[PDB]
Amino acid sequence: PIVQNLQGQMVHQCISPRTLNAWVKVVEEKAFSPEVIPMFSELSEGATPQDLNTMLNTVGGHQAAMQMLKETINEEAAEWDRLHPPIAPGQMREPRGSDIAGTTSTLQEQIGWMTHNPPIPVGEIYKRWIILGLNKIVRMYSPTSILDIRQGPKEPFRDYVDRFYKTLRAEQASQEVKNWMTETLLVQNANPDCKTILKDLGPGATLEEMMTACQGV
């Protein structure tokens, strides 16, 4: 991945054994639960397409999913080539579909594009395609989302919030949609007693005040 040096300059570092081991084990244990998808993105902090491809190839099982991912990437790469189709002296060349995915580009070339002025985020673009592909497979497994989280009649408020934000962190939605989810679904899907209390608090209270209000009940 790419990180800043002790001075402003951007430098590449070899992907760490800790990162490599964390990702493979996540796939083994969790399989394709939605929490796998953000967990990926946490490990692909400024990762190059080479590193992204490395991470994908290190996965041993679930080869059906890996092949479906490859199909989705090829579709996105085809669209990229459609939209962004000569010789420039000592300049960075234009990436095609396959170049962003690291199949036709070298490690040195990717570094050139990502550290260029203006920067060409081939790493972020490829990560987007992977996550798009990561969305398809997780959709297939067992269609579950934040909208299914409902407080049990006797369930402590604290544990319901825990389940809420665990699911919420894994749901693909913009920050605008996510904030709407926070202020709305958590209140409505509470149990009758706590819901009545949360409705009584008014629409301007922090989570601290909400949780302390439903502490007794």
Place this chain on the structure above:
Amino acid sequence: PIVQGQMVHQAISPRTLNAWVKVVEEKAFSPEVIPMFSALSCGATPQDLNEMLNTVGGHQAAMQMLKETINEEAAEWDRLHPVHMREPRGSDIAGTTSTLQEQIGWMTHNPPIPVGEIYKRWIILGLNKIVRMYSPTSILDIRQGPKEPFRDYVDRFYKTLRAEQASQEVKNWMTETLLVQNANPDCKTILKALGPGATLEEMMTACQGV
């Protein structure tokens, strides 16, 4: 390994050594060991590559097969680039007849001679042959069982294909063709009905019930 201020030599980390040895036991003969290699061996010198080789304890038959492939590639190297900073011969790239200082000189020269990457390439070629040996059956014999879930058949299909020596054109032709013909009668009939323009997602979802 070698990393970038100025590029300098670093000793291989105990974390890297430990991670690799455990992979080998756990991975066994899974193909995914090959890409995992290429990650832990980032800018490694021939000295580091030799260390990693010796870190494998078991499966000594595979180690000798690897050594055979390395010797073949070293002989071909000597054929094409006859030696007269000195020029590296076959045996120098593998780190058996070269010193650490010689390896560092070649890798950090201007222009750089990537002896580390060349040795890595030869090892991966050999690791492919070993994985090929360890893969028990060729792609063409994989057939879906009468009661076998489609998902498990596809998993076996593409795991085998990943180990098959073929170009991307040959490999893509295998994908779009062999998977469809070798399905069981119920799934075959459904996949035929999809038409010749469906993605794998649609194929997999189609044979989900049966």
